[PDB]
Structure formats: C-alpha cells, structure tokens
C-alpha cells in the first residue's frame, strides 16, 4: 500500500474519507494505508475501492512537486490566515453556547477552554513558522533544518491531541437534537477548522518538510 | 416490527439481544422504555439490519423469562447473580487497574484514571445494593410494592449515576478495547470490565424493566 499522505494529496476528496475513519493522514502521514486498518482491524477493500473511483479525475492542484516557496505562500494565505480568522469566532460562539445552553446536558462544556488553548498554541506555532522556518527554507537552507522541523512536528502532535479532545467534547462534532442555529453553525465551523488544520499539517509534514530536508 | 417495541422488552424476550444492544451502545437498562426505532435513529443506525439480527436471535426462545416470575424469586436471583458477583469482582478490578496504571504508566494508551472511576463505582454500588437489600427488597416481599414510588425513584436515579460512571469507564478504556501492546494482565482486566458492564446492565435492566414497574403495579 501507499502512504496515507501520498494518497490524500493524490486523490481528490480522500481527505474527508480518512477524517471520518479516524485515520491520521496529517501528522501520521508516515502511516501506510495498510496499517490504518490495524487501529480498527477493519476493511481495506472498501477503502481501496472508494479511492480507486475517487481518483476518476486528477487532483485540482498537485502540491507534491510544486516549488517550496509557492507551497509556503499557499499555506500562509490558505491556512494560517484562515485559522487566525476562524478561531476567535469559534471561541466567542462556544462562549455563547456554553452559557445559553448551560442547563442542557448535551452542551459541550469545556469547548471554549480547549478552543482557546488551540488558538494560543497555534498562533505561536504559526508565528514561529512564518518568522524562522519558512524564511530559512526560502533561502535554500532547508537541508540544515532538522532541529526546527522536529520542533514544529512536535507541536503538530500537540495540536492533534487537542483536536481529539475537542472532537470528544462535541461527540465528534455531531450536534444533538437540541442544537439551535448558533450551535449547529459552530459545529459546522469546527469541522471546517479540523478539515483545514489536518490538510494544513498534512501538506507540511508530508511535502514541505521532507522535501526541504532532502534539498529541493 | 421490532423497531416499535421498547428496548427493555426486546432484551428480556430475545436471547443475547442484550449483547447486540451493548454492541450498538444502546442503553436497554436505564433507557429500556425507549423504542428500538428512537434509539436507532438517535445513533444514525440502519434499524432494518438490527431487526434482522434480532429475528435471527429470536429464532430461539429466552432461556429464562423473568418478566412473569415471582418478584421474590427475581429478588433472590438478583442478590446471588448480580449483587454478590459485583462485590467479588469490583475489588479485583480495582487492584488490577492499580497494577496496570503503575506498570504501564509510561505507555500512551494506559487507562489513566481507571482505578479512581472503578473505586467511585464500587462505593456508590455498594451503598446502593445495601439500600436495596435492607429497605426496598423487603418492602416488596411484604406486598407493599404499590407504596414504593419514592424508594424506587431513588434507586432509579442512582441507576442513572451508575450509568454515567460506566460511560466514563468506557471512554477511559477506548470502549474497553486493549491496545496492541496490551499484556496479559491488561487484557484480562478489560475482559473483567466488560463482564462487569454486561452484568450491571442486565442487572439494572431486570430492576428498571421488570421488578420496579411490576412492584408498583401491585404484583
Ligand atoms: Mn503552518
Ligand atoms: Mn505547522
Ligand atoms: Mn440491585
Ligand atoms: Mn439497583
Ligand atoms: O502550521
Ligand atoms: O442494583
């Protein structure tokens, strides 16, 4: 089988399939499609059949072979800037939901705290990438960046841990029947954030970082 | 159609239907009044397949139908089959969880907090069963079950708290699924935990869905 990261970046809409299977293609892009079943000891034939047909048409944009400088500029505008705009909004929405629906049992109590931890750590994380690691790659020094890259990958792991908690506090971002408009819309935004953040980390761990280290 | 019957009645009439609902995480014990239809819709599950699985299991009658048994025999059965077993099994699980949380402290999948939650369950369950054995079960055996709305509602409320802890224990243990690196002690403990959950849900089911309502109805 091929690596998770290789398939997610080469087959359109394979990203969401892996996310709903609890398959870590971002920080666990190391993982091959085979061992992914080991976690759940579940069918691989279905996943290969789905993937084979999902690949009817080429990918909208193959970043695997794109210049590293363009990958960087793409990450800044498509993921970093979006994260900075979304998380302050989600924090406020979670505040409103945890107060307005405090008396209900299905309310995701603690979501604001966990979203806030993610915002603080992700902001610092992205500031470090944009001010230290990305410039160093643009100057052609990626081959000497094991240290900084390993620090970012460690922080990627931390963020993934927080994502798992957030997914638990919200029953895998599934609104209960009591969900109002604010509540449902917040969960939609939360799913959007998780989708973007896994594709974001995936692109970094599975393309930008290894290619930089290899001297591209 | 089975989908229109209450969970509790299905569990009490179809052999091993209890295990099918535990596989689907359907609460037939404290939520046995809930119909299979509403329970399956709540979890976005194909109810027609569940009905086929039930019809298969229902090819065979229940080995022992407690729904029509004398209340005194239900009580004596509960005490020996569930209460006495819970008392022997929780102390063993507490010590095993202690050994596992120490020995495998350095591993990621270790069920941190399992000993605390097992202990809370044991404490609340112990006092719960004593209050049943000393207060509620005697009054039902005396023919006063129709005057036991109060005590039964207190027992049912405590059944709900117990279910809350069971849900905590299940999350701490990845739904009682050992990781690949699980040793023998770790695997055997999770087996015991599943046995406890199985028994306690059949235990609570028998009380909420048979003993309590029939006692209140004057049987
Ligand atoms: Mn980044
Ligand atoms: Mn990053
Ligand atoms: Mn009891
Ligand atoms: Mn009881
Ligand atoms: O990032
Ligand atoms: O019980």
Author numbering:
A (entry chain B): 5 to 220
B (entry chain A): 2 to 220
Paper text:
We also provide a new structure of the Escherichia coli YtfE in which the iron binuclear center is replaced by manganese ions and discuss its impact on the overall structure. For this purpose, wild type YtfE was incubated with Mn2+ ions during the crystallization process and X-ray diffraction data were collected. Analysis of the anomalous difference maps obtained from data collected above the Mn and Fe K-absorption edges shows that the metal site contains in both positions a mixture of iron and manganese ions: in position 2, which is closer to E159, manganese represented ca. 45% of the metal occupation, while position 1 retained almost all the iron, as only ca. 10% of manganese was present. Therefore, iron in position 2 is more easily displaced by manganese than that in position 1. This observation is consistent with the Mössbauer data showing that in YtfE one of the iron atoms is more labile. Hence it was of relevance to determine the affinity of the wild type YtfE to manganese and compare it with that of iron. This study was done by analyzing the quenching of the intrinsic fluorescence intensity of YtfE upon the addition of Mn2+ or Fe2+, and determination of the binding constants for each metal. Moreover, the binding affinity constants of the wild type and mutated protein are significantly higher for iron than for manganese (ka = 6.5 ± 0.3 × 10−6 M (Fe2+) and 0.5 ± 0.2 × 10−6 M (Mn2+)).
